[PDB]
Amino acid sequence: ASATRLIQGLRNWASGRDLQAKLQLRYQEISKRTQPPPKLPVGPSHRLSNNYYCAR
Amino acid sequence: ANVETVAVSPTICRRGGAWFASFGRERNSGTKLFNISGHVNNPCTVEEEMSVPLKELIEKHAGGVTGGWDNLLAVIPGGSSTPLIPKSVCETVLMDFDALIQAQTGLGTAAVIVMDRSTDIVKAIARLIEFYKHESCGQCTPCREGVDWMNKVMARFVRGDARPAEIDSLWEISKQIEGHTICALGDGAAWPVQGLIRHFRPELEERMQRFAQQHQ
Numbered sequence: 001a002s003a004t005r006l007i008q009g010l011r012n013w014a015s016g017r018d019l020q021a022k023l024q025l026r027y028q029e030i031s032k033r034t035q036p037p038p039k040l041p042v043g044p045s046h047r048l049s050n051n052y053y054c055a056r
Numbered sequence: 057a058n059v060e061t062v063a064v065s066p067t068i069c070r071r072g073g074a075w076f077a078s079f080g081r082e083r084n085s086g087t088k089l090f091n092i093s094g095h096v097n098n099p100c101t102v103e104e105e106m107s108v109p110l111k112e113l114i115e116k117h118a119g120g121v122t123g124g125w126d127n128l129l130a131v132i133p134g135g136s137s138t139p140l141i142p143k144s145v146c147e148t149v150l151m152d153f154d155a156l157i158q159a160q161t162g163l164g165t166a167a168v169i170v171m172d173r174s175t176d177i178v179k180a181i182a183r184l185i186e187f188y189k190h191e192s193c194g195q196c197t198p199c200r201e202g203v204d205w206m207n208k209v210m211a212r213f214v215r216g217d218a219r220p221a222e223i224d225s226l227w228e229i230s231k232q233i234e235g236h237t238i239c240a241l242g243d244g245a246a247w248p249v250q251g252l253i254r255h256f257r258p259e260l261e262e263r264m265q266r267f268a269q270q271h272q
């Protein structure tokens with residue numbers, strides 16, 4: 001984006017897709033880096049008093 | 057041979073044939089010492105029949121329970137190698153080997169002691185596990201390592217420093233120690249922990265809830 005109106009209109013006319021809304025230059029919806037630190041869950045193991053390895 | 061069996065052995069011969077089995081039931085029979093210590097009025101030792109009701113044993117020979125009969129919390133027969141008996145079970149059950157096995161507690165030797173409602177039974181049983189840690193050899197890896205874990209876990213349950221998966225894991229280790237040792241001290245270290253988890257589950261839940269509500 002951040003282009004003037006005339007070349008925008010000629011881009012829209014030379015290819016009739018209304019090209020401005022989706023143009024594949026990523027500006028603001030890049031994922032914000034340095035996310036908060038994650039806590040990862042533990043699935044169907046680690047439960048005490050059933051985890052005999054002879055079962056699974 | 058034990059000193060009771062040796063000491064009864066001359067009177068069996070010099071007195072009548074099978075007169076000794078005129079006392080009680082048929083299989084488990086005769087006379088036995090009963091040693092009533094703990095929270096009873098005037099704790100002592102007596103001789104009685106093998107078959108005898110527990111309430112008559114406690115009241116009618118050694119004073120009474122301090123504060124009436126209703127004040128008692130639990131009664132351990134046998135001593136330290138026997139799980140505990142709550143009050144509703146010991147309203148009826150007599151003092152025989154097969155009857156206490158039907159109550160799922162192996163009768164030891166005569167140490168029929170009580171503990172009061174106003175006493176931390178978790179603290180008493182944790183000190184009993186500290187007794188087993190002080191007096192046990194270390195041939196077998198199971199009783200050595202298991203008495204280590206059970207003492208640390210019972211200390212943490214006196215302080216209430218865990219979550220109920222830990223008390224279930226205490227049930228798991230007390231299953232795994234029993235029946236895999238040389239001697240009966242490992243099995244004897246596994247039984248009272250089992251009896252505590254069988255009978256006084258919600259008091260442990262209350263202790264750990266109190267510590268959670270205070271630490272949070």
Ligand code: SF4
Pocket residue numbers: 192193194195196197199200237238239240241242
């Ligand atoms: S189970 Fe018995 S024989 Fe084995 S190490 Fe423990 S006290 Fe010693």
